[PDB]
Design an enzyme around this catalytic site. Structure first.
Site, PDB file in Angstrom:
ATOM      1  N   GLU A 180      12.602  16.634 -24.136  1.00  0.00           N
ATOM      2  CA  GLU A 180      13.926  16.036 -24.274  1.00  0.00           C
ATOM      3  C   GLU A 180      14.353  15.949 -25.751  1.00  0.00           C
ATOM      4  OE1 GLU A 180      11.892  13.313 -21.787  1.00  0.00           O
ATOM      5  OE2 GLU A 180      10.503  14.160 -23.269  1.00  0.00           O
ATOM      6  N   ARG A 227      -3.712  14.685 -18.841  1.00  0.00           N
ATOM      7  CA  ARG A 227      -3.009  13.961 -19.898  1.00  0.00           C
ATOM      8  C   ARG A 227      -3.922  13.702 -21.096  1.00  0.00           C
ATOM      9  NH1 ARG A 227       2.098  14.069 -21.629  1.00  0.00           N
ATOM     10  NH2 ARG A 227       2.657  12.154 -22.755  1.00  0.00           N
ATOM     11  N   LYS A 287       8.182   6.096 -30.230  1.00  0.00           N
ATOM     12  CA  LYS A 287       9.156   5.877 -31.307  1.00  0.00           C
ATOM     13  C   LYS A 287       9.591   4.414 -31.416  1.00  0.00           C
ATOM     14  CE  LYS A 287      13.688   6.573 -29.065  1.00  0.00           C
ATOM     15  NZ  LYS A 287      14.979   7.322 -29.037  1.00  0.00           N
TER      16      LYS A 287
END
Lengths: 76, 659, 538
Positions: free
Chosen positions: C52, C261, C271
């Site tokens: 994204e 993962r 973030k």
């Protein structure tokens, strides 16, 4: 020699009158920004509601024009 | 060595005292009471997320308005939608100024005109400052948007806004009502509108008063069927009278074998007034009469068997009436509520609305000074019990969205009391369901008085039909007894003339006012009455027929030929063709049917001004066969004919073609 | 590494196949819609890597990037860089480019760059088809808990059709009614199309119904013709959900294989936690070294070969070996060893003047930039040269080996050695400036230290593992308290030689120090170095 501690109790009583008079500045400059930005936030209430007014008038202008050739359903 | 080394240790642990202080403040601090809103962020966000709504909405209004149509258009409604754009954009700090978008009339003030600029200058506050409507109006002519109809805009009054129309758009719907039928778009989807109209008293002879509410009643009923409302017709018949007890008591004597042998009873009123003479005179009869009017309240098997048979004679006489006027109906007179009326009498004591007075129980409407009687002195139920226990079933079972009560103007005190009372206990709201009283005047003879006859009591309505097809025949043997096709045109004429005039000259005259029954002015071949309509209507289906143009030659030519509107008079007619839904809307609202008759006559006036002016078929002199057919002016005489024929279907008048 | 993704032609299914192994499904589509799959791709095993514009990409995303762009590159296919729009998310331009940058930093040119919003028309079109085919209704509840019952299931079709048509035309209030599926799987929580009323990046305005990750990132695998579609390992109880939209509309399918993962210890990458740390002051930017963001490791040095080689060692399976920096800093030790040349530099700059040595200024001398046969670069020699005081103590412990009185020590890459003579202290008791003559030790005598002469630069920045221990979360309460030993810090003294260069992502070895990379604060005058790896220690 006997004039340092007399000038000190003048410049330490200065911190006294500084940080009081500063705390009236530091709390009058709070009412200023508060009185203003408050009565603008209830003036968004005169736009945002006047918006829904000229919004609801318009959904019922479409739905009177989308029945003109289309289908309408309930209620809802 | 260490106060620098351990201060960090009291600075390493102080961090958590700040870290976890900010941590548990995230939970127990947010919204623990009635309100909830972040003003800094959210109120600046709802201002955009919803200002984005006016745009995504306006873009979708431009989508479905762009893609048309399969119908006609209420021309005046879509003008208040382009002034609705224009005016409040011109003045963003006004809420609801007048939108007087009327016709008027003769292309002098143009076709349409809007006197609204006054209602912006008249809107004269802010300390009485002169604002001339002229500068007000032209400030709207530079701030009117783009549309699919308007050619020129004008000013000519104190603030009058006279409007002209673009030829391109006027003719676009004239074709529309031609190829796809002359129909109005599903207005008011799935709303339920019930109409109480006919409703005469059984075993009393149905009269002209109770007939005015039969034609006005079912004409309205087919309007909302045409608009798109789910209509159901109600016969609020009076088979719940204390007078019905007086009948069966006369039956138990007249025919002791009513239960086993079918009773030979001819006229209702002669049998009625036979029971009446028994009533007033005898004392053993009257005590048998009201002792059985309570037996029938109690669903007595044998007594009820009588009651069922009584109606079958007064209702065979009734279906002898509906068959002619083609009144489709569903009977539910007060006989039906004898069960639930008992549960309504109860609701008004539970609510404590009923006051105790004179051995009766009455309720007081806060609008008048006239109370209602729901409990008689002998445990009987009246008229106030009926229509009040019935205004609930038409509300909470049928779940209507609007009900129209079509009775005369003499029971208006009654109905606006049952209405207001209904709102009081809280069944409906005056602006969620509009319960309105469709009132009308009184029936008068040509001698200004009660109606009528030599004697004449209550005039039997069947004879009106008898002297309705004899009157319609004596004029129609002059001299069409030969031109007419024996079975076809004699029947079609005299049965359209008869039930046409009678229905019309009462819907042409104002509903609320006293209708003067004038059999000579009602069938005057030269008059506003249906005598002239059905005659000039075949005359428009004759400009096509006399030109040899069959059912296919017009339905294809219409789909391809565009219509011209250059001449002044064909512009006067071309307008009135599309006024049809702007006239139907006014009557959906005020429910005065007398403004439709004014209109079906309105297009026929501008028609004889047209058909005489611009020549439809015109070759030739010194030889008269062919050819000069103006197909676009033949589509006009197919448009005028399709309009009136659907407007006749509304009035109830069966249209004719040849005559 | 592509020796290990080619060996998945020795495990998986070649161009086409599809029906062979996974959650295979046979409808009137399998043999006749896959015929069209090979009639468009030609086979060409297409995959995709879809993040994204919000994305930050941390080292664990390199197991994702190496996988997709790799299997394509290995078994002769292509791979879509597909930016996941879905729900409109403002702008954030720094990461919009951070991704495109980092993708290429590893060395892959994405076949195409696509956004999710590119296909909003056929996603809506197939949404319209889904309501008609059943298995798609319009419900509400939420936010009356998306988890409480299951209402409005088998509702009238056309009702949900005109409502979905209303939903987008603006006939709603940003919350009222969603569009779900008749979903089961899990806990049957279906949300295919929500309603927003928010501008978009790619297709701004015009739109106010927007799908969701589940609905969006299933069909797009079909749409763009994917034959593998590699999901991470949050997508386990979602295998049903992905194969559900395909076949229900009948499409050429992916197959969706899952990988483990693989995070990393000593690390924080979110973030909301980082842009915190940016503003606290423990770290510089989001590209600050010791952060383990991919755009940070670039700054820190860390060759993109070294990051990929690490992946070929501990990856390519379904095991999520969330491992340590030690075994990764030991993988970059492998590369900077012989991708970056020697140079040597000084920090504790101690003025050493050489009296008796030949000729005048300078005298070139050439340095083995690599202990191989490739060649020599040159740095000025005597006099006035520079060693660090950490290589000179006045009184040495026997463990000393550097410079001591009577204990001469060699100069790196030089046939000379200095014996030590008189020393100066100046004002107080600081070892100010020492001097010596050189005996040119062809006469055989071990301590051989480094040096610079006619020096240069400004700044060298040293970095430790930011947290003294492991991924600040496992109940110590909380995360903002492992920021111990400063870490930090910088030295703006620093004297380096003429081996550099002067360009700003080049790498070096500073002989007998560490491996150092140039940093984007460098010019050609005021240059600045990060210390990347510790020179083979531990």
């Amino acid at each position: 020699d006997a004039v340092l501690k007399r000038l000190e109790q003048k410049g330490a009583e200065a911190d006294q009158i500084i940080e009081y008079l500063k705390q009236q500045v530091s709390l009058l400059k709070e009412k200023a920004i508060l009185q203003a930005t408050l009565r603008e936030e209830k003036k968004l209430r005169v736009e945002n509601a006047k918006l829904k007014k000229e919004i609801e008038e318009l959904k019922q202008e479409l739905i009177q024009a989308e029945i003109q050739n289309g289908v309408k359903q309930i209620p809802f | 060595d260490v106060l620098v080394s351990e201060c960090s240790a009291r600075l390493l642990q102080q961090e958590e005292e700040i870290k976890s202080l900010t941590a548990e403040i995230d939970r127990l601090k947010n919204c623990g009471c009635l309100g909830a809103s972040p003003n800094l962020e959210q109120l600046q966000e709802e201002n955009l997320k919803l200002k984005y709504r006016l745009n995504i909405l306006r873009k979708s209004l431009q989508a479905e308005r762009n893609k048309p149509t399969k119908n006609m258009i209420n021309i005046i409604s879509r003008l208040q939608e382009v002034f609705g754009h224009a005016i409040k954009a011109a003045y963003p700090d006004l809420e609801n100024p007048p939108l007087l978008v009327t016709p008027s009339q003769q292309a002098k003030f143009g076709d349409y005109q809007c006197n609204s600029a006054m209602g912006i200058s008249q809107m004269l506050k802010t300390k009485e400052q002169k604002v001339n409507p002229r500068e007000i109006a032209e400030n709207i002519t530079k701030h009117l948007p783009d549309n699919e109809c308007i050619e020129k805009v004008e000013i000519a009054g104190p603030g009058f806004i006279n409007v002209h129309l673009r030829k391109d758009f006027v003719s676009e719907q004239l074709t529309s009502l031609l190829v796809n039928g002359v129909q109005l778009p599903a207005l008011g989807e799935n709303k339920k509108v019930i109409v109480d109209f006919s409703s005469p008293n059984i075993a009393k002879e149905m009269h002209v008063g109770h007939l005015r509410s039969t034609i006005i009643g079912e004409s309205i009923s087919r309007l909302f069927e045409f608009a798109g409302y789910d209509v159901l017709r109600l016969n609020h018949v009076g088979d719940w009278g204390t007078q019905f007890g007086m009948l069966i008591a006369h039956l138990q004597d007249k025919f002791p074998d009513y239960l086993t042998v079918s009773p030979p009873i001819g006229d209702l009123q002669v049998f009625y007034k036979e029971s009446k003479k028994r009533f007033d005179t005898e004392e053993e009869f009257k005590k048998r009469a009201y002792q059985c009017v309570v037996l029938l309240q109690g669903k007595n098997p044998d007594i009820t068997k009588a009651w069922k048979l009584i109606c079958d004679v007064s209702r065979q006489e009734l279906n002898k009436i509906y068959d002619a006027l083609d009144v489709s109906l569903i009977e539910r007179g007060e006989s039906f509520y004898q069960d639930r009326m008992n549960d309504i009498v109860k609701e008004f004591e539970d609510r404590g609305f009923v006051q105790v007075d004179d051995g009766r129980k009455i309720v007081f409407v806060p609008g008048c000074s006239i109370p209602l009687t729901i409990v008689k002195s002998d445990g009987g139920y009246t008229y106030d019990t009926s229509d009040l226990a019935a205004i609930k079933q038409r509300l909470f079972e049928e779940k209507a969205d609007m009900i129209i009560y079509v009775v005369d103007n003499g029971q208006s005190v009654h109905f606006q009391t049952i209405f207001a009372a209904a709102q009081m206990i809280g069944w409906y709201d005056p602006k969620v369901t509009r319960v309105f009283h469709a009132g009308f005047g009184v029936v008068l003879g040509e001698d200004k008085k009660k109606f009528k006859t030599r004697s004449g009591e209550t005039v039997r309505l069947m004879d009106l039909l008898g002297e309705g097809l004899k009157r319609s025949m004596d004029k129609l043997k002059e001299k069409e007894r030969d031109k007419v096709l024996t079975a076809e045109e004699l029947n079609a004429a005299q049965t359209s003339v008869a039930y046409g005039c009678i229905k019309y000259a009462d819907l042409s005259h104002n509903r609320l006012n006293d209708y003067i029954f004038s059999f000579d002015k009602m069938l005057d071949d030269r008059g506003n009455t249906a005598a002239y309509l059905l005659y000039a209507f075949t005359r428009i289906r004759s400009i096509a027929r006399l030109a040899n143009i069959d059912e296919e030659m017009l339905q294809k030519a219409a789909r391809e030929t565009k219509i011209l509107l250059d001449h002044e008079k064909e512009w006067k007619l071309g307008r009135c063709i599309l006024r049809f839904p702007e006239i139907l809307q006014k009557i959906l609202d005020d429910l005065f049917l007398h403004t439709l008759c004014d209109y079906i006559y309105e297009l026929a006036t501008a028609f004889t001004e047209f058909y005489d002016s611009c020549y439809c078929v015109e070759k030739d002199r010194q030889t008269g066969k062919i050819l000069k057919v103006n197909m676009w002016r033949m589509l006009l005489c197919e448009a005028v004919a399709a309009v009136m024929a659907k407007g006749f279907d509304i009035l109830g008048i069966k249209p004719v073609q040849r005559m | 590494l592509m020796e290990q993704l080619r060996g998945e032609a020795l495990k998986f299914h070649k161009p086409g196949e599809n029906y062979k192994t996974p959650g295979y499904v046979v409808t009137p589509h399998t043999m006749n819609l896959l015929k069209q799959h090979l009639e468009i791709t030609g086979g060409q095993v297409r995959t995709r890597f879809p993040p994204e514009p919000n994305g930050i990409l941390h080292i664990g995303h390199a197991k994702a990037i190496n996988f997709n762009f790799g299997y394509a590159k290995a078994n002769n296919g292509i791979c879509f860089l597909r930016f996941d729009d879905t729900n409109p998310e403002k702008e954030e331009a720094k990461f919009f480019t951070a991704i495109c940058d980092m993708v290429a930093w590893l060395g892959y040119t994405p076949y195409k760059v696509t956004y999710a919003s590119d296909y909003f028309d056929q996603l809506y079109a197939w949404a319209v088809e889904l309501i008609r085919r059943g298995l798609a209704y319009v419900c509400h509840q939420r936010g009356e808990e998306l988890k409480l019952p299951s209402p409005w299931r088998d509702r009238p079709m056309e009702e949900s059709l005109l409502l979905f048509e209303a939903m987008r035309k603006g006939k709603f209030s940003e919350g009222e009614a969603t569009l779900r599926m008749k979903l089961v799987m899990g806990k049957m929580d279906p949300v295919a199309y929500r309603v927003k009323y928010t501008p978009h990046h790619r297709t701004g305005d015009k739109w106010c119904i927007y799908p969701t990750y589940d609905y969006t990132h299933c069909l797009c695998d079909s749409i763009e013709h994917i034959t593998h579609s590699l999901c991470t390992k949050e997508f386990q109880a979602r295998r049903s959900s992905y194969f559900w939209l395909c076949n229900a509309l009948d499409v050429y399918c992916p197959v969706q294989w899952e990988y483990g993962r693989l995070n990393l210890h000593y690390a924080v990458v979110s973030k909301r936690k980082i842009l915190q740390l940016v503003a606290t002051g423990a770290v510089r930017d989001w590209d600050d070294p010791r952060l383990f963001t991919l755009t940070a490791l670039r700054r820190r040095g860390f060759p993109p070969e070294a990051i990929n080689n690490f992946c070929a060692r501990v990856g390519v399976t379904v095991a999520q070996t969330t491992m340590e920096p030690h075994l990764l800093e030991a993988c970059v030790r492998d590369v900077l060893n012989d991708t970056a040349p020697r140079a040597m530099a000084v920090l504790e700059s101690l003025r050493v003047i050489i009296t008796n040595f030949p000729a005048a200024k300078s005298l070139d001398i050439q340095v083995p930039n690599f202990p191989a046969d490739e060649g020599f670069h040159q740095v000025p020699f005597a006099p006035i040269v520079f060693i660090e005081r950490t290589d000179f103590k006045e009184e040495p412990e026997p463990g000393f080996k550097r410079l001591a009185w009577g204990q001469p020590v060699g100069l790196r890459h030089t046939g000379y050695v200095i014996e030590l003579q008189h020393v100066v202290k100046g004002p107080s008791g600081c070892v100010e400036s020492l001097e010596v003559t050189c005996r040119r030790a062809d006469a055989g005598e071990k301590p051989f230290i480094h040096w610079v002469s006619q020096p240069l630069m400004c700044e060298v920045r040293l970095y430790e593992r930011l947290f003294q221990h492991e991924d600040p979360t496992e109940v110590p309460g909380g995360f903002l308290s492992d920021l111990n030993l400063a870490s930090l810090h910088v030295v703006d003294a620093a004297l380096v030689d003429c081996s550099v260069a002067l360009a700003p992502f080049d790498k070096f070895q500073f002989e007998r120090l560490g491996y150092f990379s140039v940093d984007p604060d460098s010019h050609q005058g005021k240059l600045v170095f990060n210390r990347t790896v510790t020179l083979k220690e531990d």
